CSV table of C-alpha atoms in Angstrom, one decimal:
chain,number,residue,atom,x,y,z
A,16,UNK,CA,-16.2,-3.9,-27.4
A,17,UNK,CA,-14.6,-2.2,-30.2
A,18,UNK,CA,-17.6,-2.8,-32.6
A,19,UNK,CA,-18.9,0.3,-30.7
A,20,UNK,CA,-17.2,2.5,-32.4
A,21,UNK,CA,-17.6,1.0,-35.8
A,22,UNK,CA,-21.5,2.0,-35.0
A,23,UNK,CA,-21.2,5.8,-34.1
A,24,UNK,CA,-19.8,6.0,-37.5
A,25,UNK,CA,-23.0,4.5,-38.9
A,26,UNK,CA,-25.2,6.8,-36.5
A,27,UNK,CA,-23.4,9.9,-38.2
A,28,UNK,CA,-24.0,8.6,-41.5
A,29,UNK,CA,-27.7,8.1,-41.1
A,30,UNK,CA,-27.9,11.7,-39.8
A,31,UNK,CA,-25.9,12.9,-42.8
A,32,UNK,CA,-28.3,11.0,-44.7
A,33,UNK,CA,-31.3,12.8,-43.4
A,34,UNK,CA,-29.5,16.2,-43.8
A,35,UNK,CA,-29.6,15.2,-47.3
A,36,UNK,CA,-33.1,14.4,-47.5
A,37,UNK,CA,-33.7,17.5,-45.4
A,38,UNK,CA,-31.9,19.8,-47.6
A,39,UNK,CA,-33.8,17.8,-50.5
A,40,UNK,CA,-37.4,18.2,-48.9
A,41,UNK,CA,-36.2,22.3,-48.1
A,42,UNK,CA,-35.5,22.3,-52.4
A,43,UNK,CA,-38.8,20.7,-52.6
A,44,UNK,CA,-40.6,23.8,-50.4
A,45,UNK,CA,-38.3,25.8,-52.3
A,46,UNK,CA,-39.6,24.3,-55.3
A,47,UNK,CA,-43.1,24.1,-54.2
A,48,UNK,CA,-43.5,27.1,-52.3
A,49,UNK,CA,-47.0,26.0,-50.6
A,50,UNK,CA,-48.1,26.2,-47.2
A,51,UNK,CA,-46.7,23.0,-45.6
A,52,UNK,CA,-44.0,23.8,-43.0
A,53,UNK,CA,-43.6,20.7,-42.3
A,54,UNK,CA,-40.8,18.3,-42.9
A,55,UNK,CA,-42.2,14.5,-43.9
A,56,UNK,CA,-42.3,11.9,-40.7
A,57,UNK,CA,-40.7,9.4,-41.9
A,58,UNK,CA,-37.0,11.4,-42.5
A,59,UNK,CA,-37.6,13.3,-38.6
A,60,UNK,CA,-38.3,9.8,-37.3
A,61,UNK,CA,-34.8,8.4,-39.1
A,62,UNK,CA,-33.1,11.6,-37.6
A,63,UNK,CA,-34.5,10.8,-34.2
A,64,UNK,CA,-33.5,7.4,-34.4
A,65,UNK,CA,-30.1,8.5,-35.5
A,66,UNK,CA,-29.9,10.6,-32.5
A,67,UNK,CA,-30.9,8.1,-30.5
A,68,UNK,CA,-28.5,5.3,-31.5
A,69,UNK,CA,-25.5,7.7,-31.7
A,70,UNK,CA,-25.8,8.7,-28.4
A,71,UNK,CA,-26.1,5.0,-26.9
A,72,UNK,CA,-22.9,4.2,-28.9
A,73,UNK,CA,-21.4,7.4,-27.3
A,74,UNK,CA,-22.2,6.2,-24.1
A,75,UNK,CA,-20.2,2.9,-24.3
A,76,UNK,CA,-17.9,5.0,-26.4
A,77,UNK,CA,-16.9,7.8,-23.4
A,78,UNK,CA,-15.2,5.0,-21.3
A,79,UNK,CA,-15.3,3.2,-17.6
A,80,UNK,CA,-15.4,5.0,-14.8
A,81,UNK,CA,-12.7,5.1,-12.0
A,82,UNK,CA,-13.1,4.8,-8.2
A,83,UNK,CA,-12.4,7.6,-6.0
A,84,UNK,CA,-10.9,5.8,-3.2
A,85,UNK,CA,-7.0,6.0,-3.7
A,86,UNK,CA,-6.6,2.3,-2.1
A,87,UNK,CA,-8.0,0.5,-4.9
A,88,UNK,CA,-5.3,0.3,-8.2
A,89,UNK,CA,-2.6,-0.2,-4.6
A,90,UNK,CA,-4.2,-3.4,-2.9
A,91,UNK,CA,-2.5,-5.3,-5.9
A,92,UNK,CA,0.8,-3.9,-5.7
A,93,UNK,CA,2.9,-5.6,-3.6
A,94,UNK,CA,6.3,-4.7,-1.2
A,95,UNK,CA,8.4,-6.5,-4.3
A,96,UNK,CA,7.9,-3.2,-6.6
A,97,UNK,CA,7.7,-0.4,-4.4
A,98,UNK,CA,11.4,-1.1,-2.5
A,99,UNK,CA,12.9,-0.9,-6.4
A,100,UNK,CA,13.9,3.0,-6.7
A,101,UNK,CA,14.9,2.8,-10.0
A,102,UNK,CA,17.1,5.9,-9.8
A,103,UNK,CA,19.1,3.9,-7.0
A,104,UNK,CA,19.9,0.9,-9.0
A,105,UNK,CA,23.3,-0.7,-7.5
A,106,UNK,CA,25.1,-3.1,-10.2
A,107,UNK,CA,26.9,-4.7,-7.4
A,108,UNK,CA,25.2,-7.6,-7.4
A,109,UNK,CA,25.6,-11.5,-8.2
A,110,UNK,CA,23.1,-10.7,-11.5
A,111,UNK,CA,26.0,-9.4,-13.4
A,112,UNK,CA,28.4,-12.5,-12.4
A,113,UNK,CA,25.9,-15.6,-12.1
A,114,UNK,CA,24.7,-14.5,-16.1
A,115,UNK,CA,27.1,-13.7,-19.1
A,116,UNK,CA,29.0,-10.7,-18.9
B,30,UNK,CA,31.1,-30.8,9.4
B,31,UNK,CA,28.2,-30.0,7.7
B,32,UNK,CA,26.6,-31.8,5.0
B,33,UNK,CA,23.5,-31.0,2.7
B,34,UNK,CA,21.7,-32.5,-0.3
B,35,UNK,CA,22.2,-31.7,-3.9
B,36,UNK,CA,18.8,-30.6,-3.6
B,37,UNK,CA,19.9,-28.2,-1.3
B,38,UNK,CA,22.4,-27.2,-3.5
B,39,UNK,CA,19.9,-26.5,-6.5
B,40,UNK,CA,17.4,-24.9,-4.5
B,41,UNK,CA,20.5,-22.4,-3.3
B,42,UNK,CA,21.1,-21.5,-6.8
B,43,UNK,CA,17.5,-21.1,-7.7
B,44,UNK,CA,16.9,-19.1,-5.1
B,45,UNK,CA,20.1,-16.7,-5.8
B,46,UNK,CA,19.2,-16.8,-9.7
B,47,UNK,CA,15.7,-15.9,-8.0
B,48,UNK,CA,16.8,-12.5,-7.1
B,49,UNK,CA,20.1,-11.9,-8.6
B,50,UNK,CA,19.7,-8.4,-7.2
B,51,UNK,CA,18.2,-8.7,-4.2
B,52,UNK,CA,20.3,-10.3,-0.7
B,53,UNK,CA,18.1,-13.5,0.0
B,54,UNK,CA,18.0,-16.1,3.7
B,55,UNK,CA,16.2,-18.7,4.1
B,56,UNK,CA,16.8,-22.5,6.3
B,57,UNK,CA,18.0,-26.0,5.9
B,58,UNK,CA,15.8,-28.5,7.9
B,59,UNK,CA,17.2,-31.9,8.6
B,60,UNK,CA,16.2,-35.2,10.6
B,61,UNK,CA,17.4,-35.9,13.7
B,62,UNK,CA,27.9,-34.6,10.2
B,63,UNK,CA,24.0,-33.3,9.9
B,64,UNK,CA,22.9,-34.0,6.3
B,65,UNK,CA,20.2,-31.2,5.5
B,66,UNK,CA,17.5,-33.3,3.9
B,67,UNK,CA,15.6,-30.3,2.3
B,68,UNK,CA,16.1,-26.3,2.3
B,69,UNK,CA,13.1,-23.7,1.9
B,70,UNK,CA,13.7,-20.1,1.0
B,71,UNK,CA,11.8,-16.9,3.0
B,72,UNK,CA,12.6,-13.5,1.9
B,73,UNK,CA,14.4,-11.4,-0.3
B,74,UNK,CA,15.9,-7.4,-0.7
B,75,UNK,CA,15.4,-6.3,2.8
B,76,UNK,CA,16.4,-9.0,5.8
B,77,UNK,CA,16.7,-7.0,8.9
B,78,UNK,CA,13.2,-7.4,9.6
B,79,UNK,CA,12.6,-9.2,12.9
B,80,UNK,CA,8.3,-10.1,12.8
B,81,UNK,CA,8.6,-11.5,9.3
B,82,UNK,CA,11.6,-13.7,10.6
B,83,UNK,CA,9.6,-14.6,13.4
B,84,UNK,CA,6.7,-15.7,11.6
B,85,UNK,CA,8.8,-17.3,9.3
B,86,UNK,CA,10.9,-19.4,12.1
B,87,UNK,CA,7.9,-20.7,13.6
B,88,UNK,CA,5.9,-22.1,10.3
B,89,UNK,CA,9.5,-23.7,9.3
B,90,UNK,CA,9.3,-25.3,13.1
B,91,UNK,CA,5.9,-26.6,12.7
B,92,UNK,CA,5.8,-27.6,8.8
B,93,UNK,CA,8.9,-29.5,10.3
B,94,UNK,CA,7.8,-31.5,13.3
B,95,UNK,CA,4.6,-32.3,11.7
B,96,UNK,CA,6.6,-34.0,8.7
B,97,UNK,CA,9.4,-34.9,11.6
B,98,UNK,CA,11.8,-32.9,10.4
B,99,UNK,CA,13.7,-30.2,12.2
B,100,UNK,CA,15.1,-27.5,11.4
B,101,UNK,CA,19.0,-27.6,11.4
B,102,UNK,CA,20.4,-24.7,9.2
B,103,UNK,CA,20.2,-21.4,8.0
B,104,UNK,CA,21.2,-20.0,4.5
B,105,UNK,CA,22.1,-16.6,3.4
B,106,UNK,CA,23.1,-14.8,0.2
B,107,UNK,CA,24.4,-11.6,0.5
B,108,UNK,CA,23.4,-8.8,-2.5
B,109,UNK,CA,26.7,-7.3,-2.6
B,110,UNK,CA,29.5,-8.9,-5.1
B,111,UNK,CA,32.4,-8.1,-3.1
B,112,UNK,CA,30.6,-9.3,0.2
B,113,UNK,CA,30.9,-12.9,1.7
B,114,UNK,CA,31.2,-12.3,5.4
B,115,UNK,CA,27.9,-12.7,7.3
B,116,UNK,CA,25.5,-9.1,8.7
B,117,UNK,CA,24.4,-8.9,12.2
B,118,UNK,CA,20.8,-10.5,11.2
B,119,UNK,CA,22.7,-13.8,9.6
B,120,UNK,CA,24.6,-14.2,12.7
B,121,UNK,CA,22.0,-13.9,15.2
B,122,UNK,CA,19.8,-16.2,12.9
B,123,UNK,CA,22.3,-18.6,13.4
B,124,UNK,CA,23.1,-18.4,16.9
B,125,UNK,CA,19.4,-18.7,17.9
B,126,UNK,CA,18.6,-22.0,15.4
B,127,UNK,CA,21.9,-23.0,16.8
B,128,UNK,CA,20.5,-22.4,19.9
B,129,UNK,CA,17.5,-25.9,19.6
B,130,UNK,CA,20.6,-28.1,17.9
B,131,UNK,CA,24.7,-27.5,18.2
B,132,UNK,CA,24.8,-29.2,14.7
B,133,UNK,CA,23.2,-26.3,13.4
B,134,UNK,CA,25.8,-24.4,11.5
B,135,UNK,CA,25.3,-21.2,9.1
B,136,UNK,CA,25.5,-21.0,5.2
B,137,UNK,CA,26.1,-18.6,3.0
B,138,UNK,CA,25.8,-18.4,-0.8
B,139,UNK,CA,29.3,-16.3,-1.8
B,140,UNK,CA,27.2,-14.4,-5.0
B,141,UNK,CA,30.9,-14.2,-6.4
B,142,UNK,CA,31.4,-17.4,-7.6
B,143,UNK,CA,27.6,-17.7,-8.8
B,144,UNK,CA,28.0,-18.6,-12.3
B,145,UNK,CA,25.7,-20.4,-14.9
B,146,UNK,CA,26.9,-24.2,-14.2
B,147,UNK,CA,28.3,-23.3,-10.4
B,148,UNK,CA,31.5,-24.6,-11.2
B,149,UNK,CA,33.1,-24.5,-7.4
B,150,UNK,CA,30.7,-24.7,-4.2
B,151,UNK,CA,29.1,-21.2,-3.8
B,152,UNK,CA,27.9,-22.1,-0.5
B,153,UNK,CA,30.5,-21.2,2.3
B,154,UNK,CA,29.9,-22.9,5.5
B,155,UNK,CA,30.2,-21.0,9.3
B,156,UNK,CA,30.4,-23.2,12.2
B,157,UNK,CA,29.8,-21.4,15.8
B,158,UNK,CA,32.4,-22.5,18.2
B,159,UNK,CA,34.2,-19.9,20.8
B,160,UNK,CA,31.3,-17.8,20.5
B,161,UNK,CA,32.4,-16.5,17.5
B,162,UNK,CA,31.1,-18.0,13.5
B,163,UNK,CA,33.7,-18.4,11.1
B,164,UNK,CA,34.2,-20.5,8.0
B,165,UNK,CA,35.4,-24.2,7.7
B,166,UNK,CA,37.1,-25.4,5.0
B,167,UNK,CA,36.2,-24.4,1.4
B,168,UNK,CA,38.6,-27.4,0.4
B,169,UNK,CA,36.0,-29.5,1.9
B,170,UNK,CA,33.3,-31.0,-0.1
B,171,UNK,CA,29.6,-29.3,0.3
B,172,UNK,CA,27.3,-31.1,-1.7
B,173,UNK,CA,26.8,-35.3,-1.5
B,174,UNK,CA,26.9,-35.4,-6.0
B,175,UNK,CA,28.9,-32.1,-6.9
B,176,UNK,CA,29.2,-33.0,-10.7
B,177,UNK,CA,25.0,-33.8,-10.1
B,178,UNK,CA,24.3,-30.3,-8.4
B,179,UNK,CA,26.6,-29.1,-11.2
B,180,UNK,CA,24.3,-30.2,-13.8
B,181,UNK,CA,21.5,-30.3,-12.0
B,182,UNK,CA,21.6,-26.6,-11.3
B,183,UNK,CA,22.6,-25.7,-15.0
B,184,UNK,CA,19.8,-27.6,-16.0
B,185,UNK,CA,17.3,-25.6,-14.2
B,186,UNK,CA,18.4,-22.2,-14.8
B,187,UNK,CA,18.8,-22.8,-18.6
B,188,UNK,CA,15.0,-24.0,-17.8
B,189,UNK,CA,13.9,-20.9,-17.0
B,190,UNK,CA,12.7,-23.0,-13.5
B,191,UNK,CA,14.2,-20.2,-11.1
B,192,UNK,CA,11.6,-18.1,-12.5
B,193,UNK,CA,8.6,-20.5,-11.5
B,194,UNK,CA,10.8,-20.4,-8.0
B,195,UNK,CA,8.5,-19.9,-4.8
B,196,UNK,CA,10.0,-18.9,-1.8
B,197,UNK,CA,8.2,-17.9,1.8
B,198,UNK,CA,7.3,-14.4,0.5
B,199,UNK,CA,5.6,-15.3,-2.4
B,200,UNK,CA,3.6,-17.8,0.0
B,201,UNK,CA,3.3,-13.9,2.3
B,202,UNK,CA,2.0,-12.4,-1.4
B,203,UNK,CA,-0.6,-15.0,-1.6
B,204,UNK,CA,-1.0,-18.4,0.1
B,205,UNK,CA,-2.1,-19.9,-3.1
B,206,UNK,CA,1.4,-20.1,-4.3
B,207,UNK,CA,2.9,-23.2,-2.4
B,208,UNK,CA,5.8,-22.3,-0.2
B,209,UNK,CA,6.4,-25.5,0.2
B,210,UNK,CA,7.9,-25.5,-3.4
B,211,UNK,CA,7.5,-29.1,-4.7
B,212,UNK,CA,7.5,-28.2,-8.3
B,213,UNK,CA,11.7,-27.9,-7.8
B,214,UNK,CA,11.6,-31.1,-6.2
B,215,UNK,CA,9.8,-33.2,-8.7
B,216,UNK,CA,12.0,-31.1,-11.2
B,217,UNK,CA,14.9,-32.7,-9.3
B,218,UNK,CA,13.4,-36.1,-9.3
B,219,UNK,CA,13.1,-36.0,-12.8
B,220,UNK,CA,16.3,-34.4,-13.8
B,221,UNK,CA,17.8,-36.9,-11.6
């Protein structure tokens, strides 16, 4: 469905959300200047999740895949169409003269 | 003498307005001065074909002895404006259902005065006598009700009905659609 796509969006926007708490928690080592190295659970866990859930929207988002074999999309298409030739149309027909001219 | 139905008549016209563009055939069955009781169309574009024909010929022969009919006539409509006279494949279509019945005579739907309402008989009947086919009299009245084909058949293609048409190759396309058509007739009943 289409809703997919609504929820990549989302997925982005949580990342972008933890790139702001990541830039935030980097001020706050550049602020605090101690020995932690360690960014705070909870904000790698939303990233992961955001990861996670953009992907699986990707996925339905990329598309349906198509057969190989060349028979399938022609089983439908019956001898009606093919014999057409649009670029030999002929006007000489009772089309012209049974309908309003 | 030949004689058909104002049925006949209508299913001619559906089956021309069918496939303006495209030359059509089909047959007229009859029971045993032959009126043609009922019609049914088989075909369109391309008619040269002999296994489709023969296919065709012998479900018309035993859809009509199982119902008692027989069949007793053989339509055609050319795709060409400017052509009325009959191709090697109406001909010998004719001579060989010709060949069960004498009565059986050929038909064919002259596109060039196919108009909306079918103001004079389209249909141009060939009898085979002397070996050769050749025309009767267009003077001579085709249809039993003319002003009742007339209106009939001006009725259905301002319905839109010639587009829910099935002929024989629809039936070929897929069985589900009913070749025996009886959508047009109960149309006819009830425009009637």
């Amino acid at each position: 469905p289409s809703l997919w796509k609504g929820l990549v969006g989302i997925g982005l926007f949580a990342l972008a959300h933890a790139a702001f708490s990541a830039a935030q928690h980097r001020s706050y080592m550049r602020l605090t200047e101690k020995e932690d190295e360690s960014l705070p659970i909870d904000i790698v866990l939303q990233t992961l999740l955001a990861f996670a859930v953009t992907c699986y929207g990707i996925v339905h988002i990329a598309g349906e895949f198509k057969d190989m074999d060349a028979t399938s999309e022609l089983k439908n298409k019956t001898f009606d169409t093919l014999r057409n030739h649009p670029s030999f149309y002929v006007f000489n027909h009772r089309g012209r003269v049974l309908f309003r001219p | 003498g030949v004689k058909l139905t104002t049925q006949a008549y209508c299913k001619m016209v559906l089956h021309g307005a069918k496939y303006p563009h495209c030359a059509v055939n089909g047959l007229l069955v009859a029971e045993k001065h032959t009126l043609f009781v009922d019609c049914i169309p088989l075909f369109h574009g391309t008619l040269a074909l002999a296994p489709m024909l023969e296919v065709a010929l012998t479900l018309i022969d035993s859809w009509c002895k199982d119902h008692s009919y027989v069949i007793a006539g053989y339509y055609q409509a050319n795709e060409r404006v400017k052509d009325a006279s009959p191709n090697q494949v109406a001909e010998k279509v004719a001579s060989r259902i010709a060949e069960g019945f004498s009565d059986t005579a050929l038909i064919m739907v002259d596109n060039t005065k196919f108009t909306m309402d079918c103001v004079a008989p389209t249909i141009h009947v060939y009898e085979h006598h002397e070996n050769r086919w050749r025309c009767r009299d267009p003077h001579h009245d085709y249809c039993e009700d003319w002003p009742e084909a007339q209106r009939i058949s001006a009725s259905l293609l301002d319905s839109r009905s010639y587009e829910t048409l099935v002929d024989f190759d629809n039936h070929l396309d897929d069985i589900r659609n009913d070749w025996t058509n009886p959508e047009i007739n109960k149309a006819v009943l009830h425009l009637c």
